[PDB]
Chain length 316, copies 4
């Protein structure tokens, strides 16, 4: 049926099965969040927070939304603001991919950059001062309950519906705000307590597991602090994945499965594959693919990529 707003297409993303990448004795499925109009799982948060704000009477047309983002939320919030009539200002580290900057501008969002080495803790402070200075609305994605709640009601509902009456042993996800991890983990806990909730962190930014943090290349993951929305109790397995393995796995997904996703997507799949390798027969795992690989053409995901004609190849 026809849709009124493009915002009505958010959510209800497909879960597809990996055809060759999974170890023969297992089944690995992936939730493709790039089907979201904004091209990432951040669409869920963006809509949730704005709708909740409107309901709270904190958002009026023409108002300005300011937020510290690693990219995807800035894009999504910019999209929502363009569609619903709000202004948007993204506070983002200068090391995040240029695509994110362009996409944010594409939806008409403003852009405030800052030294990426300060991490999200630094950006949050900036976004906070700005809001205080100009009276802008703060989305506070790392502390806003509307973040994980939307995941409890949609992301969780999609996964549970799709696997109803079916076997499912592991759910793998990385975390930025931990909204996805918390919201889905809290529903899994009640509906399917047997499913192991696996939470990975970049090997070089293992905050929860090692109290460590350093800039990294798995954009979207590991802020330099523990987010307020996180319900630590939902985690069964806390593991790490290195950014190079993540990059290499995203590549495999594209060339071996026809699925082009981001670095974090390659991280979760790589983790899922690791568990699968030494898991019992029949084991079924689900990994989240947060965004499209399209906003990573300028990153290390394409190191070594040949943009010229294959005259050498053809030579053979």
């Amino acid at each position: 049926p026809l849709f009124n707003s493009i915002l009505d297409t958010i959510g209800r993303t497909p879960i597809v099965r990996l055809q060759r990448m999974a170890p023969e004795h297992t089944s690995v499925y992936v939730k493709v969040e790039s089907f979201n109009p904004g091209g990432s799982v951040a669409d869920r948060l963006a809509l949730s927070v704005v709708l909740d704000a409107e309901a709270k009477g904190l958002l009026k047309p023409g108002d300005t939304i300011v937020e510290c983002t690693s990219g995807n939320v800035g894009i999504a919030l910019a999209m929502v603001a363009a569609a619903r009539g709000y202004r948007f200002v993204a506070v983002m580290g200068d090391t995040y991919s240029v695509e994110r900057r362009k996409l944010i501008r594409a939806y008409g969002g403003k852009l405030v950059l800052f030294p990426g080495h300060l991490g999200s803790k630094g950006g949050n402070l900036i976004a906070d001062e700005l809001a205080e200075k100009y009276g802008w609305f703060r989305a506070r994605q790392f502390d806003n309950p509307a973040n994980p709640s939307y995941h409890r009601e949609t992301t969780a509902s999609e996964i549970l519906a799709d696997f109803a009456g079916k076997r499912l042993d592991h759910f793998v996800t990385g975390f930025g705000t931990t909204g996805t991890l918390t919201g889905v983990g809290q529903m899994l806990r009640v509906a399917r307590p047997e499913v192991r909730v696996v939470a990975l962190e970049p090997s070089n930014a293992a905050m929860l597991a090692r109290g460590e943090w350093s800039p990294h290349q798995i954009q979207g993951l590991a802020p330099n602090f523990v987010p307020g929305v996180l319900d630590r109790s939902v985690i069964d397995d806390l593991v790490t994945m290195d950014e190079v393995t993540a990059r290499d796995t995203s590549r495999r997904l594209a060339a071996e499965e026809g699925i082009f996703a981001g670095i974090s997507a390659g991280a979760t799949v790589a983790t899922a594959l690791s568990i699968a390798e030494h898991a019992p027969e029949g084991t079924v795992l689900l990994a989240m693919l947060p965004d499209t690989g399209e906003r990573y053409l300028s990153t290390f995901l394409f190191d070594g990529v040949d943009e010229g004609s294959d005259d050498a190849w053809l030579a053979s």
Copy 2:
């Protein structure tokens, strides 16, 4: 429900209503083909041709598919080949966006570039020689019946279903192979003969309307010849749209409606808006949005875009 192959998510794209861009006395809807896994309407063709080929016994695993493309079909065919186990070689003009080249490489496709000024006629000749030389399978998108047929069965079926029992006066589309135009126009003709099928061409490459052709910036449209699959009779209104107006309209779609699409998408919407302006009250129009704007960050769609912090703006 769960999906087996990512290829099972092709088609069934949303048709959304423009909230502010349409003249108050009208309704403009848009079919967002960027929801296709490959991010463009080309996914329909790619799958169709490969499945038809397999059925014909012309395609076996490991076989190599070669095709002359303006980009999107190369990406899609590369995607399908990665998922189904085929090799792919794209013949593409060197003037098409770098994103297309990267995306094709992302799915593991080979890349053969040639002087863009030769247009698709030149690329077709190249792809043909290569296939003859190495025995590769030729998709022949400009002449393959499987191209418009898939549009007759899906694209057309989605539009008709969504508007069943509803008013619809104009259907707007541009054309490359003319597969979309032909296939949907042929079904509209039978089911809703009253709907005007509007076919636009770039002002500077009006082949059908003026027998003219010149390189242009509306990537995906106007090859330098009349495609074999074209059923000229389905066209009611043949109009032109300039590439700058198309670019400006795509921008508006993004910043005013939250819809980020390609140049051709801005072209069709601009045409639809033009008709709407001087159309009777109640007039309902549908325009196709062929692909995501994400593969256009390096094109003129972003001329003048500021990639730096808004210190100037903040200054105020």
Copy 3:
């Protein structure tokens, strides 16, 4: 997502594969129209005619709609009328199942019965006379272009979308108004001309094939005249099917596949199975199942059905019969 009206759930019915009834070398799929809110394919026509009439300014709130029906259209129009604020009067043969009378009544419809043996030809005259006397709107299901048109746009679109990129050899359907056969048949002609369009008639009511008609038991099919909306050119195979075989096939569907459908439904499947029997390996067929079997409890579909306890069966177990 949430629906505003119950009428927004009309259409988009599932097509499912038969798991054990089809010959091994073939595949038989069925379109389950019982999934429509009204319980049958009639919902598509009812909504279409009403919407069309509204856009043409022929219908206004409180207006009365009258139609001669074999049952399902009466049920559907009643449902649409109840949802949209209209009054409905059904003109139905007295031999159609009582479930039909009760369903029409449930939605608030009125009932005008007439001697069934007169066929729909007789019913249309009554419907026409009532309209002229009271000014009621006539759906004219046998001549209204809005009938086959909704099938070209929805029923046909769902079928083509589901089979896109897949093998489909035969499309099987019976006909009453022929709106289904004409609407789908015409779209199939343009997009998949290779598909064989098979239209069956009851063995005892081969009106189109031989100009024969007699009251029959495959409720919903074969009126005693050739409907105006019919485009005979879409038919590749015009066959017959006897009511008993149809009845038995409906029974088999419910007990062997868990699909409970009406008589006309058993008819189409029966025909499809007949073609599948002598068809080449790989042959794929699609059969229409117009309605739920639940409005046939009082029909010969349940002749011999035991409503009592299986005391005898239970005893048959203890022993060694």
Copy 4:
């Protein structure tokens, strides 16, 4: 897309807004479980218990399933059995509608009737005795965790997805096994604790509220015992609803909204309308409609329904009464 089995169409039922029955300052939505292939919410339990049993190695092809049911579960298990290759035996009170007996029979199920006045307590004993004597599998719908679990994963997920980002104040449902109330109630507790969970019982069978039971007419609800799967903690409002009001509300739904549902369906809506009457403006309520009204043709839902021609009404028109 194409479906392999009819059982793959179970669940994902539409939720629609009532257009004229709700008080102006409120919004009442209803979950239409009739859209399930079996015609009711029972399909979710039937599939779940069977799938669970299969994964636990408790069910093998040709195995026999036995269950005491008020009807719908018998119909559904019969349907699943017919589709999956199982044998089914229903143990049902003799007072439940004959449509239930016929439907079970249609899918190939067996029927064991017993004096209705004994309630499901009496039926379970019979079911248990039969199983022990013949080794049949017991679905144990009142104690099987697979019941409420399928509701947490599907029914609740559909509700939450549809209302995500939207206002929802009350969730209304009655209960038989309480699987629906417990499964949905528990997920609502975690995701939307603000939503008021309203569970009603028949005025004459307030077993949970006052420990009272008497045979009643709201078929499907209130067994004469408190089910083991019940998690009483999910209930915020425990109310009653009389069968007549429920019956009248089902009538109103079909005639005023074009939605034809059973008695328990009329009950939930009635309760919801009652709460809506004195609720603040903007209040949004959701009511469960467990099944189609088509298996109630022989019940008091149709008391006073005229199966004859409206000759009198037609005459009433010509005159000036």
